């Protein structure tokens with residue numbers, strides 16, 4: 526027969542990581558693999574959708590209690606509810622899942638041991654140590670692209686990413702969610718300088734099965750019949766900074782001001798904070814919608830009359846926006862956002878920058894016009910992205926770099 530692997534998938538508890546890592550899980554599942562996903566109890570919900578699409582004989586779940594940590598609020602097991610800077614304790618806590626794992630693996634029949642660990646590069650320090658102790662390959666996953674990795678791995682003071690970055694190099698291979706064509710210069714730069722076994726797979730855009738992680742807040746059918754009933758096929762601008770960002774009130778008043786002034790129709794996705802409003806306008810400006818909480822981002826970005834997306838330029842959002850066929854309006858604020866701006870905005874001329882810093886407040890008047898003119902397909906920033914979508918969308922069709930790379934990956938997992 527054509528032997529397929531048993532993969533022990535270990536995502537990182539955070540939307541940017543968890544969401545594509547399951548998309549990557551479903552992709553290797555489809556190549557006839559067998560997966561065991563390891564999550565803490567509050568994170569078992571994100572596997573439901575994935576479970577309804579595979580046999581209990583091909584898809585397995587290991588659940589371990591979240592190791593408690595003094596700096597993390599009780600009952601929180603996912604970083605998206607926390608300040609991105611809190612990630613430093615999330616690393617610490619999760620690293621104590623090392624011992625429960627070894628007991629599970631040691632008491633597992635010699636047969637059923639996984640062929641490979643497809644874990645988060647953020648957990649690679651201890652996942653590698655577990656991987657070595659059973660002679661299992663530790664392939665690393667990252668939601669960011671080869672460009673960001675090169676800038677980041679090469680830092681002198683890394684700082685607290687050091688151990689995970691250098692442990693990622695000591696891995697078997699690396700899987701990242703972009704494509705070769707997008708950044709060939711850097712895929713090679715990572716493959717030779719920063720991968721001691723010189724194996725990297727580009728498998729993106731990882732687009733989703735069947736929704737995504739996890740449940741929106743205004744019901745998506747109320748959303749979809751807001752869209753079908755707005756007039757022109759490319760004239761709604763969706764505003765959302767993903768899951769990790771929440772903006773200060775001064776900027777909200779400025780961002781809301783541009784929207785009132787811009788005369789364009791829009792959806793705005795505001796989020797929550799945890800540690801343990803604009804003023805009046807929700808019904809002053811129809812249309813129109815203000816989804817608080819968590820929103821149907823991909824249903825919105827692929828809807829017909831959504832032509833512009835104002836974002837932090839997170840990498841998942843870059844790929845969601847690109848697939849969606851929508852102009853990117855970039856406002857970097859932290860994390861890989863600037864490296865994304867250097868590549869997409871500066872280098873490839875595929876997004877218009879509309880904000881500068883984590884602290885910026887924009888000219889209410891300037892932002893309103895960039896917002897009005899942003900949806901029209903003429904702009905050389907939109908078409909350069911519509912070209913890239915052409916390259917991305919066919920790099921994931923059969924014979925594409927990413928279709929092949931996933932094949933070659935599932936295979937090499939068995940060796």
Ligand SMILES: C[C@@H]1O[C@H](OP(=O)(O)OP(=O)(O)OC[C@H]2O[C@@H](n3ccc(=O)[nH]c3=O)[C@H](O)[C@@H]2O)[C@H](O)[C@H](O)[C@H]1O
Nearest residue numbers: 540541544767768769819820822839840841842860861
């Ligand atoms: C580069 C990565 O950026 C990250 O932040 P974030 O979660 O925004 O990542 P995205 O790439 O935007 O993707 C996150 C995913 O949340 C989705 N979403 C969000 C809000 C909502 O209301 N509805 C949704 O569907 C969105 O569609 C996306 O799936 C992290 O700093 C990470 O460390 C970094 O490497």
